[PDB]
A = this chain, B = another copy of it.
């Protein structure tokens, strides 16, 4: 600690000038989670590193509310209900009290907090809001982030579109964009 009014970061050039700066090589993964794409990539790199950390034949989480199959490792919150014939894809996370329909596909996607999901939808490489209420037969794929308390009708196809909070969606979007 030295009083340096505005500042070469932490005075690193001088730190090397007196030659007391050391480096520690890391064998593990490293990436900056600053974007939704980087968010998904960090999740898919970080999930396998938690095998010895937390509680969760692929037995990361297999029988919660019914006989469903998980292709790869995933984080299933114990209070959640998965359904009867869902297929939780590789490297997926699900929050507390989340409800997943009778048959679903959660592929490399994150479901946060209290969310309801219908029957037959596919959530691929995407994120959903906190109190999100998702339709039954929709199709959400690519890097699309859904804000808080959004709702989508049945049979909508959001492909890489970010929606703002409290909005409502009822129409297809086949191109990247933003919904206000």
Q: Which residues of A pack against B, CB within 8 Å?
A: 84-85, 102-105, 119-122, 124, 137, 139, 141, 155, 157, 174
- Please report whether the interface of chain A is mostly helix, strand, loop or mixed according to DSSP: loop
Q: Which residues of B contact A174 (CB under 8 A)?
A: 174
CB atoms of A104 and B124 under 8 A apart: no
CB atoms of A124 and B155 under 8 A apart: yes
CA–CA, A141 and B137, complex, Å? 12
Residue in contact with A120 in the complex, picked from B119, B124, B157, CB distance below 8 Å: B119
CB atoms of A103 and B102 under 8 A apart: yes
Q: Which residues of B contact A139 (CB under 8 A)?
A: 139, 157
Q: Which residues of B contact A141 (CB under 8 A)?
A: 155
Q: Which residues of B contact A121 (CB under 8 A)?
A: 120
Q: Which residues of B contact A102 (CB under 8 A)?
A: 85, 102-103
27 interchain pairs (CB within 8 A)? A84-B85, A85-B85, A85-B102, A85-B103, A85-B119, A102-B102, A102-B103, A103-B103, A103-B119, A103-B120, A104-B120, A105-B120, A105-B137, A105-B155, A119-B120, A120-B120, A120-B121, A120-B122, A120-B137, A122-B137, A122-B155, A124-B155, A139-B139, A139-B157, A141-B155, A157-B157, A174-B174
